[PDB]
Amino acid sequence: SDAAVDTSSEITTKDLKEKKEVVEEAEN
């Protein structure tokens, strides 16, 4: 799974962080 770093090229591995952060918006 670590190799996923190469995939990081599409810029998303980090997005997972934002996607988790937005979860707060769950409050609509």
UniProtKB/Swiss-Prot annotation:
The modification Phosphoserine is found at S1, S8, S9. The modification N6-succinyllysine is found at K14. The modification N6-acetyllysine is found at K14. It comes from the Eukaryota. It comes from Homo sapiens (Human). The modification N-acetylserine is found at S1. Residues 12-28 have a biased composition (Basic and acidic residues). The modification Phosphothreonine is found at T7, T12, T13. This is Thymosin alpha-1.
